Amino acid sequence: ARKGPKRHLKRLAAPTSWYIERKAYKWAVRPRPGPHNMRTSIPLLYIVRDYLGYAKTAREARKILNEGKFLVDGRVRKDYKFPVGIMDVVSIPETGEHYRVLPNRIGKLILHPISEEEANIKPLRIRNKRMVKGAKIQLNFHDGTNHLIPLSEKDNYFTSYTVLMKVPEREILEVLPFEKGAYVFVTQGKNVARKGRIVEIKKFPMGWPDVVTIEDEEGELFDTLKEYAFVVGRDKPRISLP
Amino acid sequence: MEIKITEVKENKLIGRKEIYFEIYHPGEPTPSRKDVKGKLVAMLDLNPETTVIQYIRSYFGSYKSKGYAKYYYDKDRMLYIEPEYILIRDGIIEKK
Amino acid sequence: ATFKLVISDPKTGIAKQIEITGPEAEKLIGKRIGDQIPVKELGINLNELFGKEFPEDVKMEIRGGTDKDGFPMRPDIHGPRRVRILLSKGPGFRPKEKGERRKKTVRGNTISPEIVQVNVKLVY
Amino acid sequence: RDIGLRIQPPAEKCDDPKCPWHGHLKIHGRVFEGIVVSDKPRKTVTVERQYYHYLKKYERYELRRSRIHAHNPPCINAKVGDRVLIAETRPLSKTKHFVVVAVLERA
RNA sequence: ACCGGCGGACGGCUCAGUAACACGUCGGUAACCUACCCUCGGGAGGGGGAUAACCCCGGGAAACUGGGGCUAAUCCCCCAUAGGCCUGGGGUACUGGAAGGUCCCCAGGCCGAAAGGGAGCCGUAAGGCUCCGCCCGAGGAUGGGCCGGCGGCCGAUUAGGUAGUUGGUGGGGUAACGGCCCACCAAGCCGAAGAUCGGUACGGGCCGUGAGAGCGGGAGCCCGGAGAUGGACACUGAGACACGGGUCC
Ligand SMILES: [Mg+2]
Ligand SMILES: [Mg+2]
Ligand SMILES: [Mg+2]
Ligand SMILES: [Mg+2]
Ligand SMILES: [Zn+2]
């Protein structure tokens, strides 16, 4: 990139969280800017063609997408470069199937089949919170989306809390606090894909990140970064997890 | 030659069904496309006009070959989806 | 000095070309761009050429011209000399690209014997 | 007042806008501890820290030293020979990128 | 075919220069920019103008290029409102380890938007109903800029080097911090633990060899850097001082 932004992406330099054959061809799809980040998302074309196998070539995959056969979080997506990330819901209504995108035990993205009723709710982690003109509170979630709340409820929401949002209407229906005894699911790091309950929280000076301790089902304790812990329930998960 | 069906899958999005099969034929040459298509349409009650044989492949020291084919429910959909070259190769349409 | 004259009628959009040389052409030498001169003084059968009745005392003003090598005249350069300057638009340059500039050779304002074509328009 | 270091602030105040305790300066990044070895220029000190480097082939150690120039607020005013604590900030001059925040042991 | 929009700054090639924050690695930006993309909150009122294409006449050996007539737009220009930026005085609503930050109220100024446009149906018509679009604000994402600590060649038959040089105060300039550049005040800064100068060379993941410890190389594939006959300098643009764009020697 001597004079401007990059537009291409070699197969060997593709993110390590995809299921893709790195030596079969030369090029890979460079994802469009969108909801999640590079390390936690995958272009839609690979979902249509490689994962589910509904298409054999890229050309016929685009014909499927242009007809509006795929729903991501309840909205039609036609761009084959659109990124799909953690906790998203992929729905095919014509075949009546639904999946949730989750990291594997080794850090790769997989599709987890889910019920139809569960397909209407998406958990969003409150990543940041700020004041906005007219004296309102804006919440910025982990997938880049935003929400507005009045000044009256400023004490019901804090960072690292989880909000259950009904899609595609984007309506709040549940708030899960981040506290001792809450049920969490790890999304990155060495202990990815493990789940459990919070035991302790530690803090450090000069802006180092804070750590949490989690007890799993069998009673073992392990530590991880606080921002890598995703709250999913009070004492039991509210969503299906593998 | 003996034809054995391995798997049949339904693709509602495209609007077609995909067929994988094996052909057992010791001491005989690789079967022609016409013979395989005739045998398949006889075996599964398919309209021959909307049936495309994607490929027939032989192996090094085997007595059997592997084949893959597709069947469309509508002629216009087949013309709209399939590449031109495969239709010419299968004799469905005439080359210019 | 022989001049090839292009007389344009603005009231109809039709133009005519005649060749003028001799003492009459000597009168035209020295004028800049943007000044009138009666055609009768120059001496021309205006009505016969255009096949149209014309008002009396009509005069024509100098609009442009080209030299014997094909270089044009630019109204914003004083004097009769020929120069080579960097241009971005205006007469004597067609850009073809946004923000493009190129070095071109042009003439000046004053008419000189080197000029061959002279474009003028009728002013009723 | 607290700036995230969890140490005692200086005794008195100053008017320097570049003082992290009383001005507008912000600190973020690495924090080091060292010995002052020069204070000739105005509001500037040189701090030296020593460490050991391991030579893999000869399986032995050698001593190396690192020298850093730091800003010296008037409210602290460190001198030659004492232990100081320095923190990283935005660039302040051609060679100054740290500021003294505490004197741990006066000479 | 022409006007208009987007792209042509990626990709492709080579290793001349460079011993340096160029590269590897851990961190920072509360000191910064970002067209295309995602979410949320709002807006689209009133006027004006030229010209290509097209017709008449051409100039020049050509490369190129002149005058006159006529016309449209998601082309161009104004007015309003929204909005942005600077400084002074108050209140403490937010994030964060910590506010020259964000939010609210007064006051003086400067800058200052938009295309309800296009396509299809039901409409006798009236008007809907989808699809693609235009502008402003808050955040993200993508792609970058800048900074710091540590790590990796040879020479003493090169021992002293530096004078905007090192730091301070007050400014300018930049997207942004900074001797980056000025005015003024001081005498600092580096060095036998090898400065300065000279030689050689793009850095790394890696590759060859050996029981190992080591010794030698770093063209081909990936990531980063630099260049377009040599040396200097600009226009447009979100992004260049631009390999198939411009100017000088
Ligand atoms: Mg390029
Ligand atoms: Mg070289
Ligand atoms: Mg205006
Ligand atoms: Mg080397
Ligand atoms: Zn102080």
**Residue-range domain boundaries for chain A:** 1-119, 120-178, 179-242
List bases, strand E, within 7 Å of protein CB.
8-11, 27-31, 35-41, 55-60, 62-70, 93-104, 132, 137-144, 146-152, 166-169, 177-180, 186-191, 193, 213-215, 221-227, 235-243, 245-248
Residues in Cβ contact with C38 at an 8 Å cutoff, skipping those fewer than 6 apart: C57, C58, C59
Structure tokens at A8: 């291409």
- Name the neighbours of D, counting chains with at least 3 Cβ pairs within 8 A: A
Residues in Cβ contact with A7 at an 8 Å cutoff, skipping those fewer than 6 apart: A30
Beta bridge partners of C100: none
Cβ atoms of A118 and A112 within 8 Å: the answer is no
Cβ of D31 within 8 Å of Cβ of A207? The answer is: no
Domain count, chain C: 1
Q: List the Cα angle D15/D19/D24 in 5-degree steps.
A: 90
**Among candidate residues B76, B80, B75, B1, the one with its CA nearest the CA of residue B34:** B1
Does at least one atom of strand E sit less than 7 Å from the CB of D26? Answer: yes
User: Residue D88: closest CA among chain A residues belongs to which residue?
Assistant: A206
**Among candidate residues A204, A158, A214, A207, the one with its CA nearest the CA of residue A184:** A214
A36 DSSP 8-state letter: S
**Among candidate residues A171, A52, A58, the one with its CA nearest the CA of residue A122:** A171
Q: Does A95 touch chain B (CB under 8 A)?
A: yes
Quote the CA–CA distance of C65 and C82 in Å, as a whole number. 13
Quote the ligand 4 centre to D55 CA distance (angstroms).
21
Cβ atoms of A165 and A146 within 8 Å: the answer is no
Q: Is B62 left (phi over 0), alpha (psi -120 to 50) or beta?
A: beta
Containing domain of residue B18, as a range? Answer: 1-96
Give me the C residues in range 94-123 that sit within 7 A (CB) of strand E.
Answer: 94, 97-104, 116-117, 119-121
**Among candidate residues D14, D27, D34, the one with its CA nearest the CA of residue D76:** D14
Distance of CA D71 to the CA centre of its chain: 8
B50 DSSP 8-state letter: G
Strands C115-123 and C2-9: parallel
Experimental method: cryo-EM
Residues in Cβ contact with A115 at an 8 Å cutoff, skipping those fewer than 6 apart: A98, A240
Quote the CA–CA distance of B83 and A136 in Å, as a whole number. 56
Quote the CA–CA distance of C51 and C16 in Å, as a whole number. 11
- Name the neighbours of A, counting chains with at least 3 Cβ pairs within 8 A: B, D
Containing domain of residue C124, as a range? Answer: 1-124
How buried is residue A124: exposed, middle or buried, by Cβ count under 10 Å (0-12/13-18/19+)? buried
* HSE value, Cβ hemisphere, 13 Å, CA-based, for A199: 12
Measured between beta carbons, the chain B residues lying within 8 angstroms of A94 are: 12-13
Quote the CA–CA distance of A148 and A129 in Å, as a whole number. 10
Chains A and B touch (3+ CB pairs under 8 A): yes
Structure tokens at B92: 């469905």
Does at least one atom of strand E sit less than 7 Å from the CB of D25? Answer: yes
**Among candidate residues C66, C63, C68, C28, the one with its CA nearest the CA of residue C44:** C28
Strands A221-225 and A211-215: antiparallel
Does at least one atom of strand E sit less than 7 Å from the CB of D94? Answer: yes
**Among candidate residues A219, A217, A212, the one with its CA nearest the CA of residue A198:** A212
User: Residue D3: closest CA among chain A residues belongs to which residue?
Assistant: A206
Quote the CA–CA distance of C103 and C87 in Å, as a whole number. 6
Helix, strand or coil for residue A234?
coil
Structure tokens at C123: 């002013």
Instruction: Output b/e per residue, A43-59; b: 16+ Cβ within 10 A.
Output: bbbbbbbebbebbeeee
Does at least one atom of strand E sit less than 7 Å from the CB of D69? Answer: yes
Domain count, chain B: 1
Cβ atoms of C43 and C26 within 8 Å: the answer is no
Helix boundaries (H) for A163-215: none
Experimental resolution (Å): 2.8
Structure tokens at A111: 């599709």
User: Residue B17: closest CA among chain A residues belongs to which residue?
Assistant: A54
Quote the ligand 2 centre to D105 CA distance (angstroms).
52
Beta bridge partners of D70: D45, D98
**From residue A5, how far is each of A8, A9, C60 by CA, in Å?**
10, 12, 58
**From residue C68, how far is each of A120, C65, C106, C113 by CA, in Å?**
81, 10, 12, 9
**From residue B54, how far is each of A129, B20, B33, B44 by CA, in Å?**
56, 10, 10, 17
**Among candidate residues A142, A140, A120, the one with its CA nearest the CA of residue A75:** A120
Does at least one atom of strand E sit less than 7 Å from the CB of A205? Answer: yes
Cβ atoms of B89 and B61 within 8 Å: the answer is no
Distance of CA A66 to the CA centre of its chain: 24
Measured between beta carbons, the chain D residues lying within 8 angstroms of A207 are: 4, 28
The label of the residue with tokens 């700020």 reads A130
A207 DSSP 8-state letter: T
Does at least one atom of strand E sit less than 7 Å from the CB of A3? Answer: yes
Quote the CA–CA distance of B52 and B72 in Å, as a whole number. 8
Cβ atoms of A74 and A118 within 8 Å: the answer is no
**Among candidate residues A86, A87, A46, the one with its CA nearest the CA of residue A70:** A46
Breaks (C-N over 2.5 A) in chain C follow: none
Q: What is the DSSP string of A147-166?
A: EEE-GGGTTS--TT-EEEEE
Quote the CA–CA distance of D104 and B25 in Å, as a whole number. 91
Cβ atoms of D92 and D70 within 8 Å: the answer is no
Count of Cβ atoms closer than 10 Å to residue B22 Cβ: 15
- Interatomic distance A109 CA / E220 C1' (Å): 35
**Among candidate residues A43, A160, A188, A173, the one with its CA nearest the CA of residue A121:** A173
Quote the ligand 4 centre to D57 CA distance (angstroms).
21
Quote the CA–CA distance of C72 and C94 in Å, as a whole number. 13
Q: What is the DSSP string of C15-66?
A: EEEEEEESHHHHHHTT--SS-EEEHHHH---HHHHHTS---TT-EEEEEEEE
The label of the residue with tokens 């040459």 reads B29
- Name the neighbours of B, counting chains with at least 3 Cβ pairs within 8 A: A
Residues in Cβ contact with C5 at an 8 Å cutoff, skipping those fewer than 6 apart: C17, C18, C19, C20, C118, C120
The label of the residue with tokens 């009728």 reads C122
